[PDB]
Design a protein around this nucleic acid. Structure first.
Length: 785
RNA sequence: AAAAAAAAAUU
């Protein structure tokens, strides 16, 4: 365990901007809360059941134990009261019926809310976790009884609204709620929310949606296989059951040992029911005919959404910032005996605060002249500018996997002609026509074609691949190119070939130049923070998880002092589940490539860590710090550069709004790029800040939250905020400030790519590891661009 | 995959 650094001070750089945040002040008195352990048997019942078990225990045992107490309870083992229960330190056993439960209640501790207030007043080092937890349980007791909790959110069925997603799924709306420490006062973070549920409906209706069926003959081959995969694991009601599988033969014929009896007869002997769909199968739970079953209401959709379900939901849930602002405000302003029990009061107005809009860097371009760009509202363009270091492309090939019918030769020639012209304008001149331009079909053609190209065209620098929409070909192109043969590839969808655009072509060149080792632009050097006065390396790290399938760890590192070029490392691995297991070897590799490229080891390591929750970040940071130092020692004994460890988070629900309407930007009306907050809603003592580095395009922007868990380098607040913002302008794929620093974003791209490498075109842990190994001809290139 | 942003316990 360790102490993260204190906030070194408040930032003062940038234009002041009046803001509102969806943090609502919580008034807490200087009182105890009394904490009791709750032991319910039978053991693991669903959390919602424990809540009603305890809720009914409280009411039935009123005169004997609870009296006028309104206890907070988390649905697990934690109960909180404003005054001690009449039971001393003794474990008291009770019994309650709904099934009969046995519940034990026992004093475990006094929790001090005054101690929490002392920490918020700066009088204390650490914010006490027991107090924050008590407050969370108390303030979320009522909505937990009234709504359907999902994580820290609460949802309600779509009463009187029709919001379909397809595949038997629907949108439920609700809100996120969390308690957060701030200076002086606790805050309640409230944000509107929405998520996907299975609609409560007849199984037969569900079956028709999933299985392509317009209207009402037994099922078929691959109908039933997909109908299963969508219904397996769901609760149905007729009492409730769980679906193991569906049956292969119809209810008319599906037997079970009773005699030997089949399903249809069984339900007219008892239920006196003539099946209207005896030709339909049964759900295995063990057999229930479809027409007797309904999906049970309130089941979260856990499976991944299709791409269009995802779209539908965003369009149903993405509102402009001022619209989101008004919805939050109205939600909060629209009785709570658990709050009253502890004299807790929640203010119904958003917190007002002042942030700063940081100045954006200037970017240096090159080629024909030392041209420059600086963003306006988070965006700039490459018009009339050439790359700082542009690659000359002399040998390149085109492979079109779209049908010639769909992408005629004159369409293809026009595409390559235009791409040549744009590339020359950008200072990455594609010299002459492709050495190879052919049509092909199917992923199976990729490997022999690329082998042939590598064999035949010495100096081949690039293969441009035209794809026919979503296809297995993409994953195979990257497998062969990145891992098998080490050949740079740039894919492009046929729709962007047959219907071209200069912006699209220009953006392609951004990626191609980076892939081939060019430098698109650099931060203007003398305007970087002072950290660049000595060799410094920037690392970005992330871990992606599957929804069996492996987790993937990615760490990227700058390879020059600009910083523009980055090298990647990636691993397959199986709170300690979040730690990057091979971090020492990965960081070692990146340090060595930096050393090789610049001829210096860095005196400082700046490490941006994505993919970790607030609750686990300290537990993750400590072993990762040890691992980074071990990597340093492996390059040279006693080599101890200063490390700054910064967690980047954007899955939180803090939202910032312009207090002054005239300062809203664009149709979405968001805060401007550069908007930074390091007071009022941030941590009372630790070193954290919000920075909305990007321009909001649609809906409400999510400002990234940065938490400094370690800092040998003693950054000032301004230096680190400015550094972080400038790194958001070095991302090669667009001339825009992006929402997280380039190295953190690359780490995600590297992890996503590894997923494609793991696809099996039609496994052992060492096999998984070799699958994501990049070929050496590309291992130190920006293949992930 | 031009790109960013944007939603998440009888049969």
């Amino acid at each position: 365990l360790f102490q993260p650094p204190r906030r070194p001070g408040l930032g003062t750089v940038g234009k002041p901007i009046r803001l509102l945040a969806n943090h609502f002040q919580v008034q807490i008195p200087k009182i105890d809360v009394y904490h009791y352990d709750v032991d319910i048997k039978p053991e693991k019942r669903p959390r919602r059941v424990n809540r009603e078990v305890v809720d009914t225990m409280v009411r039935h045992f009123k005169m004997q134990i609870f009296g006028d107490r309104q206890p907070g309870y988390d649905g697990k083992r934690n109960m909180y009261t404003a005054h001690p229960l009449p039971i001393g330190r003794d474990r008291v056993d009770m019994e309650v019926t709904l099934q009969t439960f046995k519940v034990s209640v026992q004093w475990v501790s006094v929790v001090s809310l005054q101690l929490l207030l002392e920490a918020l007043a700066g009088h204390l080092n650490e914010v006490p976790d027991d107090s924050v937890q008590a407050l969370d349980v108390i303030t979320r007791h009522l909505p937990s009884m009234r709504y359907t909790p999902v994580g820290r959110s609460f949802f309600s069925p779509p009463e009187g609204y029709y919001h379909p997603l397809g595949g038997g799924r629907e949108v439920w709306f609700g809100f996120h709620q969390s308690v957060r420490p701030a200076m002086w006062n606790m805050m309640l973070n409230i944000d509107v929310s929405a998520t996907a549920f299975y609609r409560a409906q007849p199984i037969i209706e569900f079956m028709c949606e999933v299985l392509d069926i317009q209207n009402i003959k037994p099922l078929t081959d691959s109908q039933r296989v997909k109908f299963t995969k969508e219904i397996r694991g769901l609760k149905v009601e007729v009492r409730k059951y769980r679906v193991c599988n569906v049956t292969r033969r119809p209810a008319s014929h599906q037997t079970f040992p009773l005699m030997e009896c089949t399903v249809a007869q069984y339900f007219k002997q008892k239920y006196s029911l003539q099946l209207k769909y005896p030709h339909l199968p049964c759900l295995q739970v063990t057999y229930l005919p479809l027409e007797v079953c309904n999906i049970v209401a309130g089941q979260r959709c856990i499976k991944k959404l299709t791409d269009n379900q995802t779209s539908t939901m965003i369009k149903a849930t993405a509102r402009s910032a001022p619209d989101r602002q008004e919805e939050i405000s109205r939600l909060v302003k629209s009785p709570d005996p658990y709050l009253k029990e502890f004299g807790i009061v929640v203010h119904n107005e958003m917190t007002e605060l002042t942030g700063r809009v940081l100045p954006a860097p200037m970017l240096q371009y090159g080629g024909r002249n030392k041209t420059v760009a600086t963003p306006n509202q988070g965006v700039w363009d490459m018009r009339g500018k050439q790359f700082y270091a542009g690659i000359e492309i002399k040998v390149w090939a085109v492979a079109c996997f779209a049908p010639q019918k769909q992408c005629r030769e004159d369409l293809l020639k026009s595409f390559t002609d235009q791409l040549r012209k744009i590339s020359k304008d950008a200072g990455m001149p594609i010299q002459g026509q492709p050495c190879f331009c052919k049509y092909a079909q199917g992923a199976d053609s990729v490997e022999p074609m690329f082998k042939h190209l590598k064999m035949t065209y010495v100096g081949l620098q690039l293969i441009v691949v035209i794809l026919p929409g979503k296809t297995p070909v993409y994953a195979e192109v990257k497998r062969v190119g990145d891992t098998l043969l080490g050949m740079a590839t740039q894919c492009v969808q046929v729709k962007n070939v047959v219907k071209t655009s200069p912006q699209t072509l220009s953006n392609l060149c951004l990626k191609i130049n980076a892939k081939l080792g060019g430098i698109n632009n650099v931060l203007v050097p003398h305007q970087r923070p002072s950290v660049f006065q000595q060799p410094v390396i920037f690392l970005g790290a992330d871990v992606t998880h599957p929804p069996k399938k492996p987790s993937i760890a990615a760490v990227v590192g700058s390879m020059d002092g600009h910083p523009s070029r980055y090298c990647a490392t990636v691993r397959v691995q199986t709170y300690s589940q979040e730690v990057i297991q091979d971090l020492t070897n990965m960081v070692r590799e990146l340090l060595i490539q930096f050393y090789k490229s610049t001829r210096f080891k860095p005196t400082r390591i700046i490490y941006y860590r994505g993919g970790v929750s607030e609750g686990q970040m300290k537990q993750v940071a400590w072993p990762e710090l040890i691992a980074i130092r071990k990597a340093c020692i492996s390059l040279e004994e006693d080599y101890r550069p200063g490390i700054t460890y910064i967690v980047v988070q954007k899955r939180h629900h803090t939202r910032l709004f312009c207090a002054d309407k005239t300062e809203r930007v664009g149709k979405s009306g968001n805060v401007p790029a550069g908007t930074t907050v390091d007071s009022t809603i941030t941590h009372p003592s630790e070193f954290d800040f919000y920075l909305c580095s990007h321009a909001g395009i649609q809906g409400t922007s999510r400002p990234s939250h940065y938490q400094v868990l370690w800092d040998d380098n003693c950054f000032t607040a301004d230096e680190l905020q400015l550094l972080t913002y400038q790194l958001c302008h070095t991302y090669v794929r667009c001339t825009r400030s992006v929402s997280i620093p380039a190295p953190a974003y690359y780490a995600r791209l590297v992890a996503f790519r590894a997923r494609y490498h793991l696809v099996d075109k039609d496994r052992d842990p060492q096999a998984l590891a070799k699958a994501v190994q990049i070929h050496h001809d590309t291992q130190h290139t920006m293949y992930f661009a």
